[PDB]
Amino acid sequence: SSLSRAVLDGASAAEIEAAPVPDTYLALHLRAEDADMFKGVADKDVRKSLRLGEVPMPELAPDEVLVAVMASSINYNTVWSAMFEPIPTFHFLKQNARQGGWATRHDQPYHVLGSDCSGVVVRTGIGVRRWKPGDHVIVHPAHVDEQEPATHGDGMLGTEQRAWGFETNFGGLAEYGVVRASQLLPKPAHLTWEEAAVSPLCAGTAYRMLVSDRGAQMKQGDIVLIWGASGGLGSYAIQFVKNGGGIPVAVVSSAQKEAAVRALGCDLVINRAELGITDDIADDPRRVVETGRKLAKLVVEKAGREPDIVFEHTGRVTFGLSVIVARRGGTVVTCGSSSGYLHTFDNRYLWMKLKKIVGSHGANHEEQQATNRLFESGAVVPAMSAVYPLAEAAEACRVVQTSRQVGKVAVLCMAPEQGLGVTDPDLRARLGEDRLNPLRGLTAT
Amino acid sequence: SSLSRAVLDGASAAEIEAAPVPDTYLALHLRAEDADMFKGVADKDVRKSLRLGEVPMPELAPDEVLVAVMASSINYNTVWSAMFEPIPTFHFLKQNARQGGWATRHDQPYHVLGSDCSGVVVRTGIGVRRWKPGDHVIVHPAHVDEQEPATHGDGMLGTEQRAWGFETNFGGLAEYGVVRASQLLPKPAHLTWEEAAVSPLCAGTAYRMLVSDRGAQMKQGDIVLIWGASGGLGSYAIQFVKNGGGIPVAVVSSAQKEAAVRALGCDLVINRAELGITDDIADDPRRVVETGRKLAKLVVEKAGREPDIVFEHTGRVTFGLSVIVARRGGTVVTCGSSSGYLHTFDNRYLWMKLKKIVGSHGANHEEQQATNRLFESGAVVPAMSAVYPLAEAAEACRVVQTSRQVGKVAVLCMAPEQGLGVTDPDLRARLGEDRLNPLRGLTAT
Amino acid sequence: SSLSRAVLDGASAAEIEAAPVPDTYLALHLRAEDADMFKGVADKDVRKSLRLGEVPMPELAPDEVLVAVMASSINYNTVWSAMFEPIPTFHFLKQNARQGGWATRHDQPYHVLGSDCSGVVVRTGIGVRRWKPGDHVIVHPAHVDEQEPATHGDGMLGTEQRAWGFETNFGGLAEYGVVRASQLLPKPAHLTWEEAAVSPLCAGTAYRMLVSDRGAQMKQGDIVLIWGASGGLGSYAIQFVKNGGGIPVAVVSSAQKEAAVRALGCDLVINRAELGITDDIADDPRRVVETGRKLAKLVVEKAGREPDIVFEHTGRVTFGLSVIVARRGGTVVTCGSSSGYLHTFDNRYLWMKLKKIVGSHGANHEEQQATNRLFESGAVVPAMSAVYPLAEAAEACRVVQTSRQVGKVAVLCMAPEQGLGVTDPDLRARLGEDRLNPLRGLTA
Amino acid sequence: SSLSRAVLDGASAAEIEAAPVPDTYLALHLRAEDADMFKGVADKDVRKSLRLGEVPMPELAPDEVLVAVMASSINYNTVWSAMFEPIPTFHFLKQNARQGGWATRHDQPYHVLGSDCSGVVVRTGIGVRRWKPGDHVIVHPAHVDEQEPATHGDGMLGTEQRAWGFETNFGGLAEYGVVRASQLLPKPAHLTWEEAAVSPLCAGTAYRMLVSDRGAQMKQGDIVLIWGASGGLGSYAIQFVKNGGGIPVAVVSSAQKEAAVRALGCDLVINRAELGITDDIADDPRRVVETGRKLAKLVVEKAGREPDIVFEHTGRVTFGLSVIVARRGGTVVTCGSSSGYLHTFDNRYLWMKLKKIVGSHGANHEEQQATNRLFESGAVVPAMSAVYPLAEAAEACRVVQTSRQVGKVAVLCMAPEQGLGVTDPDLRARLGEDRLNPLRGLTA
Numbered sequence A, B: 001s002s003l004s005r006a007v008l009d010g011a012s013a014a015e016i017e018a019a020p021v022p023d024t025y026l027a028l029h030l031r032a033e034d035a036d037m038f039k040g041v042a043d044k045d046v047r048k049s050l051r052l053g054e055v056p057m058p059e060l061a062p063d064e065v066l067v068a069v070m071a072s073s074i075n076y077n078t079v080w081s082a083m084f085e086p087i088p089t090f091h092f093l094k095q096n097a098r099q100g101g102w103a104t105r106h107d108q109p110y111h112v113l114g115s116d117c118s119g120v121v122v123r124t125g126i127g128v129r130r131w132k133p134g135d136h137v138i139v140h141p142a143h144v145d146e147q148e149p150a151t152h153g154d155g156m157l158g159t160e161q162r163a164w165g166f167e168t169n170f171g172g173l174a175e176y177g178v179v180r181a182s183q184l185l186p187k188p189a190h191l192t193w194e195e196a197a198v199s200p201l202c203a204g205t206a207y208r209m210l211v212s213d214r215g216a217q218m219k220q221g222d223i224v225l226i227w228g229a230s231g232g233l234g235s236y237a238i239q240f241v242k243n244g245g246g247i248p249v250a251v252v253s254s255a256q257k258e259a260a261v262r263a264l265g266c267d268l269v270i271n272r273a274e275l276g277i278t279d280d281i282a283d284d285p286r287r288v289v290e291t292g293r294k295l296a297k298l299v300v301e302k303a304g305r306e307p308d309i310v311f312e313h314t315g316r317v318t319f320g321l322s323v324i325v326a327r328r329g330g331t332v333v334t335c336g337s338s339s340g341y342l343h344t345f346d347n348r349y350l351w352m353k354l355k356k357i358v359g360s361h362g363a364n365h366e367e368q369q370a371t372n373r374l375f376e377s378g379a380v381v382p383a384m385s386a387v388y389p390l391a392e393a394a395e396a397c398r399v400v401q402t403s404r405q406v407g408k409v410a411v412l413c414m415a416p417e418q419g420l421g422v423t424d425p426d427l428r429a430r431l432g433e434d435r436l437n438p439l440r441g442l443t444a445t
Numbered sequence C, D: 001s002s003l004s005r006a007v008l009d010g011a012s013a014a015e016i017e018a019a020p021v022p023d024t025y026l027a028l029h030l031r032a033e034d035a036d037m038f039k040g041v042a043d044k045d046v047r048k049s050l051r052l053g054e055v056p057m058p059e060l061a062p063d064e065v066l067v068a069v070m071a072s073s074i075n076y077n078t079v080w081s082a083m084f085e086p087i088p089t090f091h092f093l094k095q096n097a098r099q100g101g102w103a104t105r106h107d108q109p110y111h112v113l114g115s116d117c118s119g120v121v122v123r124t125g126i127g128v129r130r131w132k133p134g135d136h137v138i139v140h141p142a143h144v145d146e147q148e149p150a151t152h153g154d155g156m157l158g159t160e161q162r163a164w165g166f167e168t169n170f171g172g173l174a175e176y177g178v179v180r181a182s183q184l185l186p187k188p189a190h191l192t193w194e195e196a197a198v199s200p201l202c203a204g205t206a207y208r209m210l211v212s213d214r215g216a217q218m219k220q221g222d223i224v225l226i227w228g229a230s231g232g233l234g235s236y237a238i239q240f241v242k243n244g245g246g247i248p249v250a251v252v253s254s255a256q257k258e259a260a261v262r263a264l265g266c267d268l269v270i271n272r273a274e275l276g277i278t279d280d281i282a283d284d285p286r287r288v289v290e291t292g293r294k295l296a297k298l299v300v301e302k303a304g305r306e307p308d309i310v311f312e313h314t315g316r317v318t319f320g321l322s323v324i325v326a327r328r329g330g331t332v333v334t335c336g337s338s339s340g341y342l343h344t345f346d347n348r349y350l351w352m353k354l355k356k357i358v359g360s361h362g363a364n365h366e367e368q369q370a371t372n373r374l375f376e377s378g379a380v381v382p383a384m385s386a387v388y389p390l391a392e393a394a395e396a397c398r399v400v401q402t403s404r405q406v407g408k409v410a411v412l413c414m415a416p417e418q419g420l421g422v423t424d425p426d427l428r429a430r431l432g433e434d435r436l437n438p439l440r441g442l443t444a
């Protein structure tokens, strides 16, 4: 379109504003009628549910910004949505729309997925401040209600807090995304679109979990055991732990995943097999205890002490272990349950050793700015390992679904090719393209 | 006007929306032309600056709500405003307006003061959720930018955080107020307009300082020394301390003010003449130490220990004392400097005894809701001691200026008479009108 | 003995020092040779394992205080001790003793139980400061190693932190207790021995869980769901919640337990049976969710919102519910698992709603002082519901074992009768005997 | 003596035990009679007050450890005490002794100074655990009362918290030191005595101020403005800031002090002199504001934003600036007032911007362990810039008195030369001697 062309041409703020908004846009999406298609299905192949096609351009709310999405990423929630698990997102869209007003737009027979992105502002609602068409932005997933009192204590805490592209429509896996202005941050200038896009959700989430005073709040010298360490969350977890003067201990399930975490500077790596952790471990209290003890011993061996923080998200199969291995007074911080949300743990290890389990979710706008600042300095780098064109986003999603990736799989959206969007090439040169892409071309194959 | 009649008649939502917004409204305001009128003037009589007259109705921003203000209150900032101290509010209005967009409205040759209020929603911007015309609200003063990341960590912390009616125009000492939706809370139903109006600013502020995890965060058993205890802040500080299971020790300068704090159930009272505190004490390090020591001894006598938290706002005169008197590891929490902001203190007492000074300001929307909840249950009650019509708001202001009040001086705005706006009379009856007005009829003389 | 006679007669410090320490003392204790007596026994009747008789007086460590124990209390760990479950306490005693030095004394074939007490200092180790014979004290259970760096961040957090009389010997269900001076606090002067003795462990634990910045750290206005609310822990929880301007909502399993919590001024009460809780709800995730929702709904109806803090200790059966019922950003604070330590919960409710589970154990010396200060002002009162003489402490223990109690079962030790040890009768009279004993005579 | 010989020879624990404790030992000390010796003297030259000679070996308390002090360091309190400023330390010794019991020993007509050290345990009181003669230790200054409840919440917060060798006698600027066992941590093995010795007081203090949850509690990304940055405190502050992934901005008064901070990898430096700071700036409110603004801008230029934490200790001259420059919601953490304790600041800057001033002092045993762990891993290195023998400790003290130093001036005590005490040479070599001594030979 004239708008996409203007965006892609690096046209001026005024020219971008002057290019009309298309009536439809290309979006990776789910269809409400398919929400039952995986009933009984063992391998709920996201490529079967994901559609790519034109969806209606919605009306922009006054506090919203239309972003020409240059790139986005696959997040696990993209996978979960495409799997209609644990609940089809359409149920969330309907709950969202039940607020009425502007919220109603979310309830659509399609759901445009994508929960972070980088791109270019093309329109702002009349209540949007500062942002101008042409502005290079990243969008983080915290779609929150700033009228809620809770939001002003913690952006993540409001009852209306939602994840963009998951509990909201108009996500980032599309040529355009509709975001609340409080989802917007300036794109790190030295990064490409795809590099910038891969971070907000996972890095912000890891940031809240580990760095922010809203999570485990690591300090230098903390040993952080990081489960599923080579993945999206883990790839950032590692960096925050290292950057904060912590000692990460990566738990990975393969040599390739080990390679990935080492590329991120995590030299202390535990392979799940050297502990014979298998999925049925969670049903076996004694084995959990025995393996937790062994795991603790290993962490002690590698890092010098039991972990201060255990970075959880792998869920039920590891959670028992996590509770056990954390040092007395330690914190298990969890933001997920990939292996199952029904967690079982021995409470004696929690109360008797005064441990904490901190439930964490996404990151508020402040945490996301903090995260962004760490990218802006090059302290933290994108965990991008692969890039797919939007045309192949279902496959990108599948890759994540099948755990064939390390780090983050980026999806070019409107960006016609890789390597665009660097507006501070000197800084990029100073940090180094390689330093910025530790995971380039690595897989979990 | 038809709109004010509709509001006063308790009209339906539709009737209120159908009633046109007046082009102008009655407002207590200052005039930009008067900013220097107190140059080299000792007693800057607020009544010489305060104007009451029609001001233009501004256009409502999309995130704003037009409130038909039923009652408001004099706050000290109203006094500071009318004195053009320490800096004329017009400078703030201009700084505010420099943001552009909707902010430019704030820059006017008039400044409508008033930093809290209760009233009725009459219009909402297209970006406002949930509120509707007819809704009974209180407005608290935290006029914040919800797009700023900092806001999502703490609503008070954004660089665009302003105090309604002080760094913003369209304050509550008028028949209408323009507020951001995130300034709105449901008015405690059992309260009259004037009762509801007196609390948000002072109570929220005291709440942040003492109750909130963002201030000194009292716990039951804490002894809290409360300076200027019979005033707006102290009158709530006392209640939060008591309600928190803390032990308030009121410092007052007079028997009338002691009576005021006793009526709030603060039975540990220190008259500052009993200490021989005079305004020049601050210039005299030795006398501050001696007196601080006497003060500490007195708190020990009355409350059993040195205060855990010193509730400051009286400023330079008391601050050195506040630092000395606080227990080891204690917190001086301060939100003001009525006696002068150039604080001097002996840092030995601060670092050697590992004390903290917590600067606090207003309250974020979360804290304000928490505050409101305590009013809602009747745990905390309005500190209203006097009510003036808007016609006499200048005098009301002068009263506070001349420290002739205890608690809070309410100002009826649109409310034509006292006692209106109780929409939960049963609750009111249960709590008791007298419990709700401990300070009724009390003065500082 | 002349020492016990000196203590009971309120003799001077000099006189107490001149009265020799007896070589043995009367103690409720277990014998290591009984550790196996309940193998294959379903009802591990504590009256069968608990012995009362003379045990050797140990040599006082330099940082220790010999307390003539006027009164103690039954604690849940006392029961578990007497059941030798899940591990005979002797395992903990030997583990303690493996530290060597003074710790070796704890490794004995007898274990004097008792994890709190009130009494009179009779001897101090040469490294004890300030405490003197004749001093009226309470003992709290935090037997900690003050050389450990962790102890100086949080007394509860050292690896050598132990529960007095559970992982240490010379507990307070005896006429004498051997404590570290960092277990000692001045006895609230207006309380009788038994009243003062019932509180340290449970009140301190509840304090840490709810009031302290080491626990959930309630604020006024917080709604606190209190599981097992009529018990030792619950009876103090209710009171700290109330005292701190919180809104307690007690969960109790019966009418009698409801009566107990209301006696403590907890007017919001949910009955567990009301809601169908059995030991297999935990195993039914859909039931936990549906029952949690109902519980949440019931709290919203009662308190106006979902609980800000859930005070857990009941364990597996309620824990899944706890995680569900807590508000967004809410805290489940847990110090035990009465119904089973294998907790199952739906982590979606934890992470998606940014809730926290805070594990808490005991209370450090600071928290215990803060707890004690709340007893000293009368802001919080003892939860004493019953008093047994030491002779009948096995019965008292069986009562707790069989959940026949509410609040705290006190045990007179050296105190020859109830009602002694009040040294501030004026404050006692001011507060009110009944005020101080809201649970007097109540049972489950 | 046979003891010192046994220690320098690395004798077995049993050998160290068999060697008698001398009745006296070599100590850098003050004499009570001299307390008045600088009445009307403007330059209170510490070389005139500091004595080096034999002092009586005190009797060890049960919780105490006698350390063969190998190396110590000059601290500013050493200087202050040698000046008898602001109060002669003897006053604190008498206050300390007023506790009675073991505290009485501290009231002597001599005061042995030295507030940190590295050395070899040679005797332990009967209540001391774990430590054994021969053990290589560092001593940190937190001489605290572990019976005080406060200590169990924070070792620094007890009423009886004292600075070893300042408010206690038997400090470390001597061949032996008497320390409570809760002052002891294992000496980082890869360090020499003097390297190990220079850190505990300054690094632990900086740690508490910056890293600990008891201070400003920096996180990565934080910009930390560090006043007096080349000094003892600053030298560690810079390192904790960098190590925590923070961004330090040093303020130094000179090109040399700048060289020092850059040696510690502080890239961003603001010269104080350029800003115009004089001891009457604080007295000029307008100047403080304009100067604070230029400072803020300087920080913004260098680091990208106003500082998140202002690391204070320079006191009254800088403090008003500190309050001004700190970001909105930022923290000024202060542990001293070198330029004067009468601080003046514009409170509008504090409350209106919701800033905090956190008073900090020393570091509890936990923070000191944590600090020690960062030395153990090599994450933080000693700030030793100079070494004096104990013979020359007065001069070392004078060097610090006259701000001629950068980092930490170490004093060898029983160590007969530099370079001794490395018991993990492999780690030493991996880290690097130069790495471990960034300030070697530097001055101000």
Ligand SMILES: CCCCCCCC(=O)SCCNC(=O)CCNC(=O)[C@H](O)C(C)(C)COP(=O)(O)OP(=O)(O)OC[C@H]1O[C@@H](n2cnc3c(N)ncnc32)[C@H](O)[C@@H]1OP(=O)(O)O
Residues within 6 Å of the ligand: B035, B075, B076, B077, B080, B085, B086, B087, B088, B091, B115, B141, B142, B143, B162, B163, B164, B201, B205, B335, B336, B361, B362, B363, D348, D349, D352
């Ligand atoms: C949600 C919060 C609720 C708050 C509830 C209630 C709060 C209270 O009651 S607090 C009491 C209100 N009183 C106060 O003193 C707060 C007023 N604010 C201030 O003093 C300042 O903004 C302060 C100190 C916080 C920060 O100042 P700072 O960031 O350095 O600059 P700024 O705000 O622009 O103020 C100084 C500028 O004002 C201008 N100014 C100063 N005096 C005057 C004057 N007489 N006329 C015109 N302009 C003036 C000048 O341009 C000056 O700049 P310069 O340095 O060249 O002289």
Ligand SMILES: NC(=O)c1ccc[n+]([C@@H]2O[C@H](COP(=O)([O-])OP(=O)(O)OC[C@H]3O[C@@H](n4cnc5c(N)ncnc54)[C@H](OP(=O)(O)O)[C@@H]3O)[C@@H](O)[C@H]2O)c1
Residues within 6 Å of the ligand: A075, A076, A077, A080, A201, A202, A205, A227, A228, A229, A230, A231, A232, A233, A234, A251, A252, A253, A254, A257, A313, A314, A315, A335, A336, A337, A338, A339, A340, A360, A361, A362, A363, A400, A403, A407, C351
């Ligand atoms: N804000 C939030 O609450 C938030 C944010 C991001 C992610 N999450 C949740 O956190 C989890 C991880 O997300 P992510 O982006 O890091 O995903 P990811 O890139 O796929 O990485 C997950 C890592 O965990 C392990 N893993 C992968 N699939 C798993 C499975 N099905 N079961 C158990 N372990 C598995 C793998 O490591 P090993 O093979 O080494 O075990 C993988 O490297 C997901 O469930 C996600 O939905 C939550």
Ligand SMILES: NC(=O)c1ccc[n+]([C@@H]2O[C@H](COP(=O)([O-])OP(=O)(O)OC[C@H]3O[C@@H](n4cnc5c(N)ncnc54)[C@H](OP(=O)(O)O)[C@@H]3O)[C@@H](O)[C@H]2O)c1
Residues within 6 Å of the ligand: B075, B076, B077, B080, B201, B202, B205, B227, B228, B229, B230, B231, B232, B233, B234, B251, B252, B253, B254, B257, B313, B314, B315, B335, B336, B337, B338, B339, B340, B360, B361, B362, B363, B400, B403, B407, D351
């Ligand atoms: N959010 C904030 O930062 C915030 C919010 C509210 C108020 N404040 C500031 O807090 C201060 C008190 O506000 P308030 O509403 O409590 O005012 P108030 O109702 O007038 O009460 C102030 C009390 O302080 C003492 N006092 C009065 N005038 C004083 C003066 N000129 N100098 C020193 N002490 C004086 C009086 O007690 P004695 O006569 O017993 O000493 C009076 O009771 C003001 O400076 C206000 O601007 C700040």
Ligand SMILES: NC(=O)c1ccc[n+]([C@@H]2O[C@H](COP(=O)([O-])OP(=O)(O)OC[C@H]3O[C@@H](n4cnc5c(N)ncnc54)[C@H](OP(=O)(O)O)[C@@H]3O)[C@@H](O)[C@H]2O)c1
Residues within 6 Å of the ligand: A351, C075, C076, C077, C201, C202, C205, C227, C228, C229, C230, C231, C232, C233, C234, C251, C252, C253, C254, C257, C272, C313, C314, C315, C317, C335, C336, C337, C338, C339, C340, C360, C361, C362, C363, C400, C403, C405, C406, C407
């Ligand atoms: N420092 C610590 O970590 C610490 C300190 C004190 C206690 N605790 C633990 O906290 C729990 C409560 O002890 P506390 O003295 O209150 O004991 P308690 O006096 O017996 O009170 C426990 C309450 O919880 C319920 N309960 C009792 N037995 C139960 C069971 N087997 N399963 C489920 N619920 C049960 C009962 O309430 P209703 O039947 O409604 O439910 C009872 O009133 C125990 O696990 C104890 O070991 C831990």
Ligand SMILES: NC(=O)c1ccc[n+]([C@@H]2O[C@H](COP(=O)([O-])OP(=O)(O)OC[C@H]3O[C@@H](n4cnc5c(N)ncnc54)[C@H](OP(=O)(O)O)[C@@H]3O)[C@@H](O)[C@H]2O)c1
Residues within 6 Å of the ligand: B351, D075, D076, D077, D201, D202, D205, D227, D228, D229, D230, D231, D232, D233, D234, D251, D252, D253, D254, D257, D272, D313, D314, D315, D317, D335, D336, D337, D338, D339, D340, D360, D361, D362, D363, D400, D403, D406, D407
């Ligand atoms: N635990 C505690 O409370 C604790 C612990 C250690 C130290 N302290 C206090 O912290 C302060 C610094 O001690 P530290 O060993 O860094 O001392 P230091 O090695 O002398 O370093 C002090 C730095 O502060 C500056 N300075 C020195 N004298 C000054 C003065 N009179 N006025 C203003 N600035 C001055 C110098 O920096 P230049 O670049 O600025 O001008 C010097 O490099 C002392 O007052 C000490 O008593 C307190």
